[PDB]
Amino acid sequence: MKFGKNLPRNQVPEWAGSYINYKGLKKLVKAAAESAKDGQPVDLAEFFFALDRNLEDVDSFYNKKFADACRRLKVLQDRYGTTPEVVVNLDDDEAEELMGALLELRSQLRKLQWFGEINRRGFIKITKKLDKKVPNTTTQHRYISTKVDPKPFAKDTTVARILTEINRWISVLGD
Numbered sequence: 236m237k238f239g240k241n242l243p244r245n246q247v248p249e250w251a252g253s254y255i256n257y258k259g260l261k262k263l264v265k266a267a268a269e270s271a272k273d274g275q276p277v278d279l280a281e282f283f284f285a286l287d288r289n290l291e292d293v294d295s296f297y298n299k300k301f302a303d304a305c306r307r308l309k310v311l312q313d314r315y316g317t318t319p320e321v322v323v324n325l326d327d328d329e330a331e332e333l334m335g336a337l338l339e340l341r342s343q344l345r346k347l348q349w350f351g352e353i354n355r356r357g358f359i360k361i362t363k364k365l366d367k368k369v370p371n372t373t374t375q376h377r378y379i380s381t382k383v384d385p386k387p388f389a390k391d392t393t394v395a396r397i398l399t400e401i402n403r404w405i406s407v408l409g410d
């Protein structure tokens with residue numbers, strides 16, 4: 236899959252500047268590729284520094300949003316309770332307000348997941364690109380496995396877990 240051309244299309248627009256800066260990372264790759272083309276040694280340290288910064292930022296952003304989503308879920312539990320079957324004790328206003336809150340939280344979680352998946356693709360694609368464009372460079376699988384795969388944005392399965400619950404609530408509430 237063409238990652239760079241599809242990036243705008245796959246970005247949660249409100250968070251655009253917090254995605255992996257694929258465009259800037261590609262210019263660092265191209266610089267290295269040019270040196271190798273000229274028969275010169277490369278210096279991949281500025282690519283990796285920038286890659287690491289991007290990784291820190293992506294993680295830090297995803298984690299903050301995830302902490303937000305959890306706080307939100309707690310506030311909804313405080314108001315409406317811990318299981319969806321409580322909907323039977325709600326009046327029509329309360330039940331509509333609940334539904335609104337649930338749809339918004341689901342939207343936020345879906346967006347968070349997609350942010351995670353697209354950023355992880357981006358790290359995988361940019362390193363693959365470096366490996367393809369620079370001689371005896373073999374970084375993709377090591378970098379992804381050792382630095383990206385341990386981060387919540389990449390490994391998270393809790394958002395999906397919470398999404399199934401929010402959806403179960405939404406269905407229980409519908410009836």
Ligand SMILES: O=P(O)(O)O[C@H]1[C@H](OP(=O)(O)O)[C@@H](OP(=O)(O)O)[C@H](OP(=O)(O)O)[C@@H](OP(=O)(O)O)[C@H]1OP(=O)(O)O
Pocket residue numbers: 236237238239240241261360364
């Ligand atoms: O999506 P675009 O901005 O048009 O970029 C493409 C695309 O790169 P991305 O998928 O990384 O965005 C191609 O990458 P592949 O998916 O084919 O590996 C790659 O094609 P070549 O590797 O055949 O050249 C080429 O990237 P680059 O220029 O880094 O090679 C690049 O096109 P331009 O950068 O030339 O626009």
